Design a protein around this ligand. Structure first.
Ligand SMILES: CNC(=O)c1cc(C(=O)N[C@H]2[C@@H]3COC[C@@H]32)cc([C@@H](OC)c2ccccc2)n1
Length: 113
């Protein structure tokens, strides 16, 4: 039970919560990669250079891609940042991003030392 493993278990706990029924009402747009073509967002990949979503974070966690909590947090925040960059701030998806990021930031702050 080394510090990095321990901190990544906390990250995995957060990830499970973000994917849980508890938060499904505002988390669901972040479950899978933005389907730009399907949503008619033909400028999405010109504006967003590094797409990110919770399925990609889950795949990277399962594959032991993340070496520390900082790397995991950078992907979760990239996902939110992409949402805030692309969308007008009054879009429903931005309100949902804000709510899910509140869940993330408050639990991430409870990281074991
Ligand atoms: C991470 N997801 C997104 O950023 C996103 C963007 C847009 C969308 O159209 N963005 C266009 C900008 C520019 O032009 C106007 C806004 C739509 C969706 C939908 O996901 C299924 C959706 C539909 C309803 C509620 C929540 C999310 N997600």
């Amino acid at each position: 039970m080394g510090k990095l493993s321990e901190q990544l278990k906390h990250c995995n706990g957060i990830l499970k919560e973000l994917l849980s029924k508890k938060h499904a009402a505002y988390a669901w747009p972040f479950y899978k990669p933005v389907d730009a073509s399907a949503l008619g967002l033909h400028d999405y990949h010109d504006i967003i250079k590094h797409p990110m979503d919770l399925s990609t974070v889950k795949r990277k966690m399962e594959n032991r891609d993340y070496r520390d909590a900082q790397e995991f947090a950078a992907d979760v925040r990239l996902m939110f940042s992409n949402c805030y960059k692309y969308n007008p701030p009054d879009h429903d998806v931005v309100a949902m991003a804000r709510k899910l990021q509140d869940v993330f930031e408050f639990r991430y702050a409870k990281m074991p030392d």
